[PDB]
Design a protein around this ligand. Sequence first.
Ligand SMILES: C[C@@H](N1CN([C@H]2c3ccccc3CSc3ccccc32)n2ccc(=O)c(O)c2C1=O)C(F)(F)F
Ligand SMILES: [Mn+2]
Ligand SMILES: [Mn+2]
Length: 179
Amino acid sequence: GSHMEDFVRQCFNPMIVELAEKAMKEYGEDPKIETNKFAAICTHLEVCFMYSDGGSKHRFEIIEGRDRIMAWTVVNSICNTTGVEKPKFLPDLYDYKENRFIDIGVTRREVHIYYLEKANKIKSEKTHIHIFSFTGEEMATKADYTLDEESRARIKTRLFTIRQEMASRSLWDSFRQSE
Ligand SMILES: C[C@@H](N1CN([C@H]2c3ccccc3CSc3ccccc32)n2ccc(=O)c(O)c2C1=O)C(F)(F)F
Ligand SMILES: [Mn+2]
Ligand SMILES: [Mn+2]
């Protein structure tokens, strides 16, 4: 029973906690043990949901937070109706306005380090990348940040509040030094 586990459960809403638990268990991982992983998945999930709420109604299809099979099923339907190339790895959203998949990343390092890593691995030229840090920095493919500044600002604010909350509980150092 870790302090980080209890922090996560009282920092994120239950819908996000529940989805993060399912995601970890789907790959045989325990939120009770891999607690920094637990906190990172919850954080990333909330960012994805705030991101999808930033556009017009029906702008984004949400891929994240789904079962592996249903996630690829929705990706298949999108590709087979828009003609967009199927990505090698699961993205997080699809943008019906810009007609591209989005892989969101949240990093405790400098944004550009994590971007380079995700690009190289993704190997999907068309999949748009959007990285947020816990320091208010962001980095997006082709300097195209998709959303307007106000919707990105509230994401960056939330991420910094999570950071302060961990720090006030002496959990931030372990969280940063575990990525
Ligand atoms: C399962 C899906 N994953 C993997 N993995 C994911 C995850 C989920 C369950 C168990 C382990 C891990 C690796 S740790 C981590 C840390 C923070 C947020 C998400 C995650 N990702 C890391 C960064 C992402 O941007 C992202 O989209 C994912 C993601 O979606 C996949 F694409 F592989 F099918
Ligand atoms: Mn994802
Ligand atoms: Mn992601």
